[PDB]
Design a protein around this ligand. Structure first.
Ligand SMILES: Nc1ncnc2c1ncn2[C@@H]1O[C@H](COP(=O)(O)OP(=O)(O)O)[C@@H](O)[C@H]1O
Ligand SMILES: Nc1ncnc2c1ncn2[C@@H]1O[C@H](COP(=O)(O)OP(=O)(O)O)[C@@H](O)[C@H]1O
Ligand SMILES: C/C(=C\COP(=O)(O)O)c1ccccc1
Ligand SMILES: C/C(=C\COP(=O)(O)O)c1ccccc1
Lengths: 253, 256
């Protein structure tokens, strides 16, 4: 709880290949989380277990035709199956946890996740059975259904539990001046609103906004005594060193 | 007080979807056949299922149903909840393959328990999923408890909750027996099928967590009112669930 972590879709899945899990990475990241000894609450993304189908059927644009209902069900099962594999690696590393699918628990209205009943999540956290949220299709009070991002799930948990630290884990050392497809890429030290408004593009299946949307969430979640970090989960032991407080190459808001 | 539903509430019992003998063993053939039988019937349905063999084994070993009494139960509960969520995904996959959109709704992730009752304080998400055509599939689970830390809700209780919420026309429990017998038909060769269950006949019949046939019959008798009938059918008899869903007369126990 004290340190709120998002395991991004870019590290836990092969974002260019539908339904392709990165088990070795998730296992290591879970091991680094336990080794750090920190009090932690983990969210994860859908990656290629949700974005490929959601983009093909424009699920985030709302319920427009009936061909979307089977695709949404398929995508929901795919992402719940990804969550089980994440939870499996957590349990194996000594971190009791359980998937909490927002599309089975909550609703959406105007791009916001509506969490009317916080008791199950708070009781699970109190018991020590870490509630693990993740991006999902969610019923929408206007568009029939919508998509909530794990990024916003981080925001809900942040205002719910007030963490001391917020850590996003993705396949990049941090936010750059431009995507590391141009070799003029320059790592950005500290995120401010102006330093991003920076070239942020999307070259893989995406539905929830990419690095730019994660940056806004990071900027929104900063407070008087709360830093928000983006760290490269593909760098061995870098997440462990961050939770321990050691110096790591990363971006902070 | 009218009814506004054609939905048939169905429980795929853990005795049928898994091997209660072995552990963590999914009966793909049987569940696939039952999913096909549900699809062929053309009825509007809502499926609950049991927690299966491995969930019941861990829960009994760690006395999960008796509440949170020491810290060793915490990793055991999380392990058991992951197994039953994996089982639910496998049940849901068979529904999707038949063209029946569905999604798992884990009670321990969405609800709480108190005094042995599953508490659904917010019904909006479940109802919206059903109105969208994505069938919400509940199941027996470890659930946070307001007095004991955690407890166990069975799929049978999940059926009573959804029966109160959605007011089905018909309720069908799918298990590994023709119905309620005078005694356990597996250990009494003289056991006779009770085709129609009443409070009298259930009490005088000779009947693992959350109870067995007796608890099932009690929920069945409670759900028979306002012209709704409740059935127990043998899911291991091919085409029997299908014929029951089509309205045909089959070997079963009915409560009227
Ligand atoms: N300016 C930028 N700085 C860093 N990465 C960028 C930038 N623009 C695009 N990207 C790309 O965005 C990807 C990560 O996007 P994001 O969706 O936030 O990851 P996740 O799947 O973890 O949510 C990176 O792999 C990177 O290639
Ligand atoms: N009087 C009885 N009539 C029928 N079955 C009985 C009776 N007494 C015990 N049983 C046993 O109860 C079992 C049903 O267990 P149950 O918990 O209802 O399964 P599930 O809920 O997984 O479908 C049957 O396999 C049968 O062996
Ligand atoms: C793409 C997605 C969620 C996005 O969340 P994310 O941005 O955290 O990856 C999803 C789509 C269909 C079913 C389940 C999930
Ligand atoms: C026994 C059980 C559920 C009972 O439900 P059932 O009676 O329908 O089989 C359970 C045990 C551990 C984890 C999750 C569930």
């Amino acid at each position: 709880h004290m340190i709120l972590i998002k395991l991004g879709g870019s590290v836990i899945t092969d974002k260019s290949e539908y339904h392709k899990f990165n088990k070795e990475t998730v296992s290591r990241l879970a091991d680094e989380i336990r080794r750090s000894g920190q009090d932690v609450m983990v969210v994860h993304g859908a990656g290629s277990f949700g974005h490929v189908i959601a983009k093909k059927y424009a699920i985030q644009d709302g319920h427009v035709d009936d061909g979307q209902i089977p695709a949404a069900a398929r995508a929901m099962c795919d992402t719940r199956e990804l969550s089980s594999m994440v939870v499996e690696e957590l349990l194996a590393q000594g971190i009791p946890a359980v998937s909490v699918a927002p599309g089975s628990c909550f609703v959406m209205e105007d791009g916001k996740l509506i969490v009317d009943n916080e008791e199950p999540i708070r009781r699970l956290a109190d018991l020590g059975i870490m509630p693990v949220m993740f991006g999902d299709v969610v019923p929408d009070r206007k568009k029939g259904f919508a998509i909530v991002s794990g990024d916003q799930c981080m925001e809900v948990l942040c205002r719910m539990f007030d963490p001391e630290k917020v850590v996003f884990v993705s396949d990049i050392d941090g936010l750059y001046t431009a995507d590391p497809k141009t070799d003029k890429k320059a790592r950005l030290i500290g995120e401010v609103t102006r330093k991003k408004l920076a070239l942020t593009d999307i070259t893989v299946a995406d539905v929830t906004g990419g690095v730019h949307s994660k940056m806004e969430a990071m900027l929104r979640m900063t407070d008087r005594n709360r830093r928000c970090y983006l760290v490269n989960g593909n760098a061995p032991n870098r997440l462990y060193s961050l939770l321990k407080g050691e110096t790591v190459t990363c971006t902070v808001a």
